[PDB]
């Protein structure tokens, strides 16, 4: 993270799409370097749905400028998450802040 910033880094990191943002809130069921499985909360279930959310992370993918695109998890097993929370930090991102 930048020690001195402007507060806009979160907006850029979230809106760029490089990070994995939770679509629905809940509790993280499983975390692995390439996969996040989230147990959706009881209040946000579509009737007749599985009740889980799966986020497959991009690992070491070539970019247009021959750089590395890598998504690293920033959540642990059992951590509550709400909608819009950052689950995995993409390239040049630290805990949802542009880095």
């Amino acid at each position: 993270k930048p020690l001195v910033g402007t507060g806009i880094e979160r907006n850029v990191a979230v809106d760029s799409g490089v990070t994995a943002v939770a679509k629905r809130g809940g509790v993280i069921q499983s975390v692995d370097a390439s996969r996040i499985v989230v147990k959706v909360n009881e209040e946000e279930l579509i009737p007749g749905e599985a009740g889980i959310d799966i986020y497959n992370l991009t690992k070491y993918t070539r970019s247009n400028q021959n750089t590395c695109i890598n998504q690293r998890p920033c959540v642990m097993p059992g951590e509550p998450v709400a909608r819009g929370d950052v689950l995995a930090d993409g390239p040049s991102t630290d805990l949802g802040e542009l880095a």
């Binding site: 930048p2 020690l3 400028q65 750089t67």
Partner: protein
């Protein structure tokens, strides 16, 4: 506000510290602005330009 922050961290209010030359051990004649700056590595690498 910056000066108050520096005083909280027990640092000089001017942001300048007394530094010593590592090659001789002699203190520089004037205080030097020492701090932390956010530096970037641009996509202009000598490997791709040599």
């Amino acid at each position: 506000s910056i000066k108050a922050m520096l005083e909280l961290a027990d640092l000089p209010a001017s942001g300048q510290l007394t530094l010593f030359d590592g090659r001789t051990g002699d203190a520089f004649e004037r205080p030097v602005t020492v701090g932390y700056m956010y530096m970037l590595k641009l996509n202009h690498l000598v490997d791709d330009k040599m």
